[PDB]
């Protein structure tokens, strides 16, 4: 939907498109808009990666859901398990040196 001067995202699984609606391919701008977060917590995020299909969209993640709860990583041997831990620890240290990691 369109706002006064920007856009926001709200999802409820009860509204459906009407019949006869035209179909169009999606540009990278709409892809950027879809993953956008609330304007209140924009500068409190950490970069994660870029999709492989278009290679032109940036994926962020707010610190709140980044570290409030617990987490677990699953995968095969050497497929971004220790590398991801080291990279995430380095990034959270760089964003906030006050953090403690053991």
Partner 1 sequence: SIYQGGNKLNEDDFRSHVYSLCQLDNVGVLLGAGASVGCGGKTMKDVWKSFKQNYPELLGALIDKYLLVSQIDSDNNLVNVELLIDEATKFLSVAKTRRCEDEEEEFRKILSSLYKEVTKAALLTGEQFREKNQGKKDAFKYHKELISKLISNRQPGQSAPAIFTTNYDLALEWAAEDLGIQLFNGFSGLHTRQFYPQNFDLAFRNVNAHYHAYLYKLHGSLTWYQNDSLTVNEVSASQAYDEYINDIINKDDFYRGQHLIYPGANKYSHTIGFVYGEMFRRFGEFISKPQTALFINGFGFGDYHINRIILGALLNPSFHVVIYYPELKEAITKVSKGGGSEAEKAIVTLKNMAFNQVTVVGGGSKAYFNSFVEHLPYPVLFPRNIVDELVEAIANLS
Q: Which residues bind partner 1 (CB under 8 A)?
A: 1-2, 24
Tell the smallest beta-carbon distance from residue 4 to partner 1 (Å).
Answer: 8
Could you tell me which of 97, 95, 98, 31 has the C-alpha nearest to residue 66?
A: 95
**Closer by beta carbon to partner 1, 24 or else 71:** 24
**Closer by beta carbon to partner 1, 2 or else 70:** 2
CA angle 63, 94, 58 (to 5 degrees): 55
Tell the smallest beta-carbon distance from residue 29 to partner 1 (Å).
Answer: 11
Tell the smallest beta-carbon distance from residue 35 to partner 1 (Å).
Answer: 18
Residue with tokens 């095969």: 76
């Amino acid at each position: 939907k369109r706002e006064l001067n920007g856009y926001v995202f709200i999802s409820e699984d009860w509204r459906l498109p009407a019949l006869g609606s035209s179909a169009v391919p999606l540009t990278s701008d709409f892809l950027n808009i879809i993953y956008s977060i609330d304007k209140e917590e924009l500068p409190k995020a950490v970069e994660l990666g870029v999709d492989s299909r278009t290679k032109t969209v940036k994926i962020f993640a707010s610190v709140d859901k980044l570290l409030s709860r617990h987490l677990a990583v699953l995968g095969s041997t050497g497929y971004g398990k220790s590398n991801f831990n080291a990279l995430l620890t380095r990034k959270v240290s760089e964003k906030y040196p006050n953090s403690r990691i053991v």
